[PDB]
Amino acid sequence: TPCTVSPDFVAATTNAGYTIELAGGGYFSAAGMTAAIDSVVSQIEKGSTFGINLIYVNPFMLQWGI
Amino acid sequence: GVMLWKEFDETIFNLPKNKLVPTLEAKRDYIISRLNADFQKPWFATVNGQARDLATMTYEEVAKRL
Amino acid sequence: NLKGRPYTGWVDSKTKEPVDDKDVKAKYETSILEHSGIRLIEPELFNG
Amino acid sequence: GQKGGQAIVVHPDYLYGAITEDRYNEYVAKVSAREKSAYKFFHNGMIY
Amino acid sequence: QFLNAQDIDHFLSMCQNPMQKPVPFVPVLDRRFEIFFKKDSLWQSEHLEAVVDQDVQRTCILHGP
């Protein structure tokens, strides 16, 4: 939640050559996540990828997240 | 901060609903002292390190503390 | 909660509709002056 | 039933001429505190 | 002048606003104390500049034994 929420880490890990989940826990709106995911995508190299952590206990996070 | 958290789960937050507000009044002054010393969320109504309540603070004292 | 919304203020005692302090005179002065002071004896006050 | 009465009320600033500057300044503080507490109580009891 | 009884009730209403980052303090001891105390506990480690004495030792840091 606090650690892999920062796009700047998710980027640095992915650039290093390793897999990382961007944390949904740190985002409340689909708008504010989109802003983050866009921040990741700008900082990573072409053809790199990352993933997303959504908590099943937070049914608010799921009805925007999915 | 977390050791305070732990003590409250044992002392305050495990109590049934009818028993809670009596318990909080009994140890009011203790709780306020702990929150101010030890926790990430301090007790709002303290002016120059002296405990109070919202109802015993001036409108200026409140805006200074915000 | 007033009809969903969270409200903290005065409220007409009969309709429970929110009233501002600036609007008290307009809404209620007339009624306060008719039902205060020396006036015709109101029977409901003195057991009919 | 033949029941006259008179009272004279003198302005309270005539009291404070009879006491020392230390005593007055002590009293002033003590009242200024009370008046705040009383206001706290008044408005709480009014709305509840 | 101490806070008018109504303006305390207004203050505590703005503390319960959900369109607002949960407020970095406990403004009352009532039934809602477990929420006020726990609500929004994980960001402070990342940002000590905005905690009372810039003090780790207030904070929650999640970690495995």
UniProtKB/Swiss-Prot annotation, chain A:
Signal peptide: none annotated. Belongs to the fungal fatty acid synthetase subunit beta family. Fatty acid synthetase catalyzes the formation of long-chain fatty acids from acetyl-CoA, malonyl-CoA and NADPH. The beta subunit contains domains for: [acyl-carrier-protein] acetyltransferase and malonyltransferase, S-acyl fatty acid synthase thioesterase, enoyl-[acyl-carrier-protein] reductase, and 3-hydroxypalmitoyl-[acyl-carrier-protein] dehydratase. Present with 91800 molecules/cell in log phase SD medium. [Alpha(6)beta(6)] hexamers of two multifunctional subunits (alpha and beta). This is Fatty acid synthase subunit beta. It comes from Saccharomyces cerevisiae (strain ATCC 204508 / S288c) (Baker's yeast). The gene is FAS1.
From Swiss-Prot, chain C:
Signal peptide: none annotated. 4'-phosphopantetheine is transferred from CoA to a specific serine of the Acyl carrier domain by the C-terminal PPT domain. This modification is essential for activity because fatty acids are bound in thioester linkage to the sulfhydryl of the prosthetic group. Coiled coil: none annotated. Belongs to the thiolase-like superfamily. Fungal fatty acid synthetase subunit alpha family. Present with 17000 molecules/cell in log phase SD medium. Fatty acid synthetase catalyzes the formation of long-chain fatty acids from acetyl-CoA, malonyl-CoA and NADPH. The alpha subunit contains domains for: acyl carrier protein, 3-oxoacyl-[acyl-carrier-protein] reductase, and 3-oxoacyl-[acyl-carrier-protein] synthase. This subunit coordinates the binding of the six beta subunits to the enzyme complex. [Alpha(6)beta(6)] hexamers of two multifunctional subunits (alpha and beta). This is Fatty acid synthase subunit alpha. It comes from Saccharomyces cerevisiae (strain ATCC 204508 / S288c).
